[model samples]
Each structure stands twice: as structure tokens, then as C-alpha cells.
Target: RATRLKRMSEYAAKRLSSETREQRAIRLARMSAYAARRLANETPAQRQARLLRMSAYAAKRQAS
Candidate 1:
């Protein structure tokens, strides 16, 4: 478990350190579109449930 986490960080650092601006743009754009697609594909009930969890989560976060 710890080995995988260490390896992931190692790989992430290697990739991030070597990437160019175009690579970064593609990465961010992919994440942006993927996030929008996920929201578009979600049901109303799922969105409501997600909002409920987020509200409670934020409440606890700020209430603390």
C-alpha cells in the first residue's frame, strides 16, 4: 500500500517536472471537459444527493 503511494508520487513528480506548456494545457482541458461531461451525465437525484453531502461537508468544515 505504502509502496504504491510512494511510486505514484515518484511518477507524478517525474511527469510534472518534465511536462511542457502544451502538455499542461491538454491536461487541464481534458480534466475540464471530463468534469463537465460527468455533471451532464448525472441524474437529478444523484445531483441532489451530491449537493446534500457537499452541504453537510461544508457545514462541518466551516462550523468547526
Candidate 2:
């Protein structure tokens, strides 16, 4: 447990030091917002409908 914690801490320090905190935070927030909006607004039926339309379009492209 101690070794795992130490390694994790080192990794966190290295990551935080190397990356832009603001950009990372914004990207994470954007992903969370995207998932929430997609899941909340588009239920299973709607997603299936969208996917079926996309598949039809792709098939048309392949044929042409």
C-alpha cells in the first residue's frame, strides 16, 4: 500500500508538473459535459435511430 501510494504520488507530481492544469481541467469538464448532454438528451431509441441513419449514409457512400 505504501509503495503504491508513493508511486502514485510521484506519477501525479510528474503529470501535474508536465501538463497545463487549466487545459486539462477544461478538457475534462468538456468531456463530462458532452457525456452528460448526450446521455440525458439522447436516449437509447434516439441513439439507435441516429446510428441507423449514419449506417445507411455510409452504405450509400460505399455503393457510389
Candidate 3:
């Protein structure tokens, strides 16, 4: 998860810069792959709940 986050962050950084359209698509593909991996065992309801909780936590952390 940590490694995936790092990779996502790197791609996200590139996304903010001058990456081409294909590069942006590749970044999205990487993000989608990470999401797919994260949802491997999670049901829809559980995934939604988990995402809500995680979002709140991430927001709080960012605020600090």
C-alpha cells in the first residue's frame, strides 16, 4: 500500500506538470490498478464505508 501510494504520488506529481496526454492516461491506469488491488476482497458496501472513513482521516491529517 505504501509503495503504491508512492507510485501514485509520483504520477500525480507528473500529472501536475507537463506530462503529455498519454502520460496522463498512464497515470490514471496506475491509479485504477491500485484501486482494483485495494478492492480485491472488499464488498461494495464495505469499500464505500472504508473509503468514507479513510477520506475523513486523510482530510484530518492534511488539515494538521
Question: Candidates' lDDT values, in order?
Answer: 0.95, 0.90, 0.91
Best by TM-score, which number? 1
Ranking, lDDT, top scorer first: 1, 3, 2
Q: What digit string (tens of lDDT, one per residue) describes model 2 on residues 1-64?
A: 9999999999988886777889789878999999889867997899999899999999999999
Q: Write the per-residue lDDT of candidate 1 for residues 1-64, one digit (tens) a residue.
A: 9999999999999998889999989999999999999999999999999899999999999988
Between candidates 2 and 3, name the one with more favorable lDDT. 3
Better of 1 and 2 by TM-score: 1
lDDT (Cα, 0-100) at 24 in candidate 3:
81
Determine the C-alpha RMSD for candidate 3 after optimal superposition of all C-alphas: 7.2
Clash totals for all candidate models: 0, 0, 0
Error of 1 at 30 (Å): 0.3
lDDT of 3: 0.91
lDDT accuracy of residue 5 in candidate 3: 100
TM-score of structure candidate 3 = 0.44
Pairs in steric clash, model 3: none
TM-score of 1: 0.75
